Amino acid sequence: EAPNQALLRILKETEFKKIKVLGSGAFGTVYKGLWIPEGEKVKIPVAIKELATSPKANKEILDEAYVMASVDNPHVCRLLGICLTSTVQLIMQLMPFGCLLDYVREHKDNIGSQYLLNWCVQIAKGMNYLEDRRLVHRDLAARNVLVKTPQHVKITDFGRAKLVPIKWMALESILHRIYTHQSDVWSYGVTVWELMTFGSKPYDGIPASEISSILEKGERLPQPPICTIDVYMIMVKCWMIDADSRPKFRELIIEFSKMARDPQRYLVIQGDERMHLPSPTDSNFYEEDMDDVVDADEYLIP
Ligand SMILES: CC(C)n1cnc2cnc(Nc3ccnc(-c4cnn(S(=O)(=O)C5CC5)c4)n3)cc21
């Protein structure tokens, strides 16, 4: 197929500064930082990811670097560069509001129908882009959707992306290790469920070994209280046995866009519209010299 002419930017250790740890886990360790390149007079807020110097960890992270450097869409996370230390770290855009899963849990009392429906549109757009680029994510979940601003989300974690999260997986994946754009659609359905429930754990308490049997019997995730039959019916279509019967991401963009034009017809939330989340038009929305600070989305290169 087509040659991948993406550029892999090697960044000097001296070009950036680690400020603090943002999070640790199975995924590794992610740090908050500032990237001050050459004599550019720019300060880019960044996130630095790394998993002992084991040859396997460097191999797996460089595989993620490959995919992350190959993507370029507003609703997908691109790699800014890599730093060749003993560990080898990924330099990415700082998403100041963290993952969407923690955001929906921590801000439920201020999340309205407009915000929820727009997130669904944005995830579908990012996902449709990955389909256009012939990439199968294989790990779409609310934990892998990061928040740049409450009005702007992006898909990340390309560590499993190809050209075990059982509770997010399509039945074909669990039983036969079959991954397609239509298996990502199933994971999209589960991600939407996580959002509408304000971060509930799918099939909470049920062990992963039971899931396969539960789905085979015809059991699916329940209808969230805020969801109209209109929104739940979409989620249900994402969880059909026949992958080709599931909607396409381009159809999910359309469906949720129509709904995002009249959000109170499709999501019933007590105290809707009166709710408000931070905006780039808010006071103190943007710790150091805020002079010369440029977001990665505005710091471009040929
Ligand atoms: C711990 C992590 C979720 N986190 C917390 N506050 C953050 C602020 N900004 C980013 N920035 C990016 C940008 C693009 N990709 C990532 C990225 C890729 N993989 N991961 S992960 O493995 O931490 C993911 C599973 C939670 C994050 N982070 C990541 C942040």
Alpha carbon gyration radius? 20 Å
Main beta sheet: 5 strands, antiparallel
CATH-defined architecture of the largest domain: Orthogonal Bundle
How far is it from the N-terminal to the C-terminal residue, by CA?
24 Å
Q: Looking at CATH, which topology of the largest domain would you report? A: Transferase(Phosphotransferase), domain 1
Assigned CATH superfamily of the largest domain: Transferase(Phosphotransferase) domain 1
Task: Kindly provide the name of the CATH class of the largest domain.
Answer: Mainly Alpha
Q: Number of helical segments?
A: 8
**Total number of β-strand segments?**
7
Q: N-to-C SSE series?
A: EEEHEEHHEEHHHHH
Number of domains: 2
The strand order across the widest sheet is 1-2-3-5-4
The percentage helix is 25-40%
PDB class: transferase/transferase inhibitor
Keywords: protein kinase, inhibitor, TRANSFERASE-TRANSFERASE INHIBITOR complex
Assembly: monomeric
Entry title: EGFR kinase domain mutant "TMLR" with a imidazopyridinyl-aminopyrimidine inhibitor
